[PDB]
């Protein structure tokens, strides 16, 4: 009868090569964004400039990763429900490619938007608190890699911020780009929200597995 612990969370964990590449790309973005006059003009929402690398002080300590289901060893809602799925068991330990379409910043978080393939969507949970469907967006829209958080912000916030951004962008509030950074168009969504839409999507290798701490 004896029950088994679940992981702390399921997700795609980037290889060291991929993790370092994306981490470097994220840091260059914060450096460039912070230098951009359009960003400096609207510093209200955050002769001195703001170093965003310092602002987003809390970074993922290990390799970067895209979380599917936070489980807390079973103490999270729907953890056992998610973990016993056939597709989760089959995909365990398996290698995937994650497509990064954009990098974004809010006063709370910094992260990368992941656009899941159809296969990868099968690994996306259905019972997320405040899902994409709740905001008129397709499931898996809030898939992401967290690059950094403000001091009193928890990592789960990054998914909420991406969702909020995509609801702005969906409803035609994207507008025209305020400018351009090296690797894409820079969009200002107001209220401290910024998005860099990559000219060429970035691909990273990651293994779908369970994290225990
Ligand atoms: Cl979702």
Residue numbers in the entry: 160 to 205, 212 to 378
Verbatim from the authors:
2′,3′-cyclic nucleotide 3′-phosphodiesterase (CNPase) comprises 4% of total myelin protein in the central nervous system (CNS), being the most abundant CNS non-compact myelin protein4. CNPase consists of an N-terminal polynucleotide kinase-like domain10, a catalytic phosphodiesterase domain11, and a membrane-anchored C-terminal tail, which contains a cysteine residue that undergoes isoprenylation. The catalytic domain enables the rapid hydrolysis of nucleoside 2′,3′-cyclic phosphates to nucleoside 2′-phosphates.
Tyr168 interacts with the substrate ribose moiety through C-H…π hydrogen bonding. An increased KM, whilst retaining similar kcat, is an indication of decreased substrate binding affinity, with a minimal effect on actual catalysis. In the absence of the aromatic ring, the serine OH group appears to be enough to retain catalytic activity; this could be related to differences in water networks or overall dynamics in Y168A and Y168S. To further investigate the binding mode, we also attempted co-crystallization of CNPcat Y168S in the presence of 2′,3′-cAMP, but even residual ligand density in the active site could not be observed. These structural features suggest that Tyr168 also has a role in fine-tuning the active site conformation with its bulkiness.
